[PDB]
Design a protein around this ligand. Sequence first.
Ligand code: NAD
Ligand code: NAD
Lengths: 244, 245, 244, 245
Amino acid sequence: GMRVGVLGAKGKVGATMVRAVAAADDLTLSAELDAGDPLSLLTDGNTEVVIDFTHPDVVMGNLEFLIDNGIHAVVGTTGFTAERFQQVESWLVAKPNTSVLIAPNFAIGAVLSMHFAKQAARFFDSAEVIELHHPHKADAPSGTAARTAKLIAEARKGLPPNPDATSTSLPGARGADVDGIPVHAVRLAGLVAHQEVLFGTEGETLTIRHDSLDRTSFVPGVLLAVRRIAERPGLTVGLEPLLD
Amino acid sequence: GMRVGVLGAKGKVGATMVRAVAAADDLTLSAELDAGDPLSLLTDGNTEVVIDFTHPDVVMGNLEFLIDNGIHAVVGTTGFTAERFQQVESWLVAKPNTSVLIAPNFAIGAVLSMHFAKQAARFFDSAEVIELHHPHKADAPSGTAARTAKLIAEARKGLPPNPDATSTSLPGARGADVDGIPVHAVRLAGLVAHQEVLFGTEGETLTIRHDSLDRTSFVPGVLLAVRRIAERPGLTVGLEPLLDL
Amino acid sequence: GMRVGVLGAKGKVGATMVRAVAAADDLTLSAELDAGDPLSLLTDGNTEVVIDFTHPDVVMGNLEFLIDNGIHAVVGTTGFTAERFQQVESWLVAKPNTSVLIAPNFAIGAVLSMHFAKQAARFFDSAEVIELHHPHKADAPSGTAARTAKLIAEARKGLPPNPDATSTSLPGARGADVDGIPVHAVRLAGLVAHQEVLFGTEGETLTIRHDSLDRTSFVPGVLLAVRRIAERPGLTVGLEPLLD
Amino acid sequence: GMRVGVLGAKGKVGATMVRAVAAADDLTLSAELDAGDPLSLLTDGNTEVVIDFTHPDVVMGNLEFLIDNGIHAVVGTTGFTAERFQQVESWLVAKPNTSVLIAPNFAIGAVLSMHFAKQAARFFDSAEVIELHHPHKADAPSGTAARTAKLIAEARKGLPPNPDATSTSLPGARGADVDGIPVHAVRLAGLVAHQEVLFGTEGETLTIRHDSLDRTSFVPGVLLAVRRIAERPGLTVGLEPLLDL
Ligand SMILES: NC(=O)c1ccc[n+]([C@@H]2O[C@H](COP(=O)([O-])OP(=O)(O)OC[C@H]3O[C@@H](n4cnc5c(N)ncnc54)[C@H](O)[C@@H]3O)[C@@H](O)[C@H]2O)c1
Ligand SMILES: NC(=O)c1ccc[n+]([C@@H]2O[C@H](COP(=O)([O-])OP(=O)(O)OC[C@H]3O[C@@H](n4cnc5c(N)ncnc54)[C@H](O)[C@@H]3O)[C@@H](O)[C@H]2O)c1
């Protein structure tokens, strides 16, 4: 059984992961840190892997310590840039046996969904994204939808644009344009989080739908990442490569 | 056994209805007119009901003749304004046994779907419409989606608006506003014509989806209208009242 | 504001309805009874309407008292037969101003869904039902699905059967037969309760889908019934007539 | 620029592929054979690739000739057993530059859908397949659904079975069992061919849906196979490996 530490243990996600690690028989909780706890608590407790959902301003310092001490890191904290990835990559040159996974989404369905979308995108004339959320959601479209449409568009570099004969419309009917890909945002009481990618070509359509029916649906992807992170030395960006 | 005439018999929809009337055992084709044929061909053939898919510039003159001679009319021709409806209603006062049905949708699935949407609308916090069509379609949103959202909005008079906390958006993300109801138009190769109405309230959602997989799916609604139109004297707007719901 | 009592106040549903009535500004909780409390508590507190989710063995006695004292009843308790409806009908002859609503389902979406299904059934060649539930569900198909298929079949009396050319099949592929209507039951981790009715005819299909994303989704139908029950004197069976 | 022959040129699928090859600018029709035409017509016309949709009783003899003369083969003909596959593999050892693709589905949407299903299968507690077809369909479940469920089951070797507390059921409610995966077959007028794979785990679900709205939707997959088959020497089973995923 692996020894797992949690950074950000009192936060919304951290406290959830503490409970998840305690429930899982194969993972033993080795340390549980929040703000102001020294990172040496992780080595004092023989931690092998850490789950980090902290804050963009502290995650770089934490990562330096972790990599330095041979502690694998599963990181959900956001605010990662190209420069930050570089820096992490450089720290790992010194520590070739250490694995760091930095991912913006740990829901397995969402991760598979994005990957399927990217793989299918080149074979169809048309692609559109539809996302549906509860009406308390502030941003339209969602981050996941906009990220998905950007991947689709990138996979479609050098294909013709979506065919569209629209010559009379009310404004807004055709959705938002995200790198040439229409994205539609439905806001409906009674929903949680849902996303459909639609692909079409004469004669056939393909749809990939992800439905998240509770806020904690990301937990198994984080546990999966903890159980597998050591299979890939160095930096992995996104959960997809651990899934393979 | 009914005697049925078709006006617009060489058009896309007219020629299709000619074939449909000929196939149906209980309906006899009595006349088949296109542009330049005199309307007296209808009475020379003892027409009881006419199916009219012509053009907004000729339908009012055809209707006057039909109503005047007691010939029931099933009309799919568009461009009908509130004033034109009022005018047809006024002609019928003189001819109280004549029936005229004017309808923008004859597909039974689409008609049912609109009627369900109107009935469900008062009972949910949220309503939205999604329509999906082949990418050769000129208008967004479609006439059917816009008409549906208008019915939903009318059924929701005096309820709060759709709840929406959206404070950051890219333009167009939330669709087009049709009388307070968002409408989203997907344009996708490989589709024909598709519409979903979504209703929601905390804890549950209800969805009504109509899929039309061929362009002639409207034919049974028109035949149904022809078979039933005489049951309702006067002007009927929309196919729903003849459905006997 | 109406004065509402709850019978079965300590039960799963009752305790939920107590909270719902207390939250609603227009409804004032007048009495809150469980097993062993005398029904005179309802009249002592000037109750106008009672919500009753008790048990089939006690609901008939409760109903007699309620009807006798001019207290409208919204009843979710099950185990109602033709004889029991008759008996209720006869008690109401004496009390023509009293309203009693007995309903097997208070989720508005489920009630509308069944009604739409019944109204559409005669216009299509084919009808099938698909229901999807979490895998902890004991019964397949669900009660709602089987009830829905029976209504569809009744609305289809005197039409031809569903066309089906199936001549080679694995057994079970075509679902369960409920009065000539195929019903399919999906059991999937991550679902709550979902039902689709599918109708088809050459050239077109119509689908009516109900999704319940939490166990308390019936609450607004019960509150709706409490707010409207007085609009119909006598016995109403099912929530549909109050919706109209 | 490739020279493409069609075997089975008068059949339903063969005649359709003849027209598709003629329309494509980069493929030249080199020969067009039906039953009773000698195979030497293929070599007399300098055929590089053949599309074969014939009949399980003739395809093995055709394949022998093709492989022997270095002609790549894209084969949609069914009735291929494990032993026949092994036999084709054995012929190709002698002809290491020849490529043969044998595939039960050429619709790109269907092929992708199966591949996604296989990739998602290990990561969810539950998997089920729903297929929907027009009511003239003879087999339930369809070959595609059964093949899909078999792939899912194989990807799930060594995981627990689908959780299911069902203790009371009407027969058939839970579908057909195909290697531990429930498959449900809907037969509905107005449909063509449709398949959904559903995966679930506490808190989330993932659905992959393929809709084919016409019977010729397989044509681009066959053309894609013809254009790429030479990239993979030897026997390829299924279209997926040529998709370059
Ligand atoms: N990738 C994903 O799937 C995903 C999903 C949700 C949230 N997030 C991200 O994860 C992060 C956490 O989200 P949250 O909602 O739980 O935030 P939160 O503010 O509720 O929790 C963060 C916790 O980290 C603690 N913390 C801060 N600095 C620390 C340090 N140096 N050492 C130990 N603990 C420290 C804080 O005291 C706090 O308790 C955010 O950056 C958010 O954007 C990612
Ligand atoms: N129609 C619907 O939508 C729907 C939905 C769920 C449950 N139900 C039905 O409603 C009933 C209640 O369900 P539950 O899960 O809350 O059951 P429960 O056993 O949790 O609650 C029943 C409560 O009623 C109380 N009770 C019994 N006799 C009483 C009396 N004479 N006076 C006052 N209280 C009394 C019990 O003490 C208990 O607390 C069941 O019959 C069930 O089948 C209906």
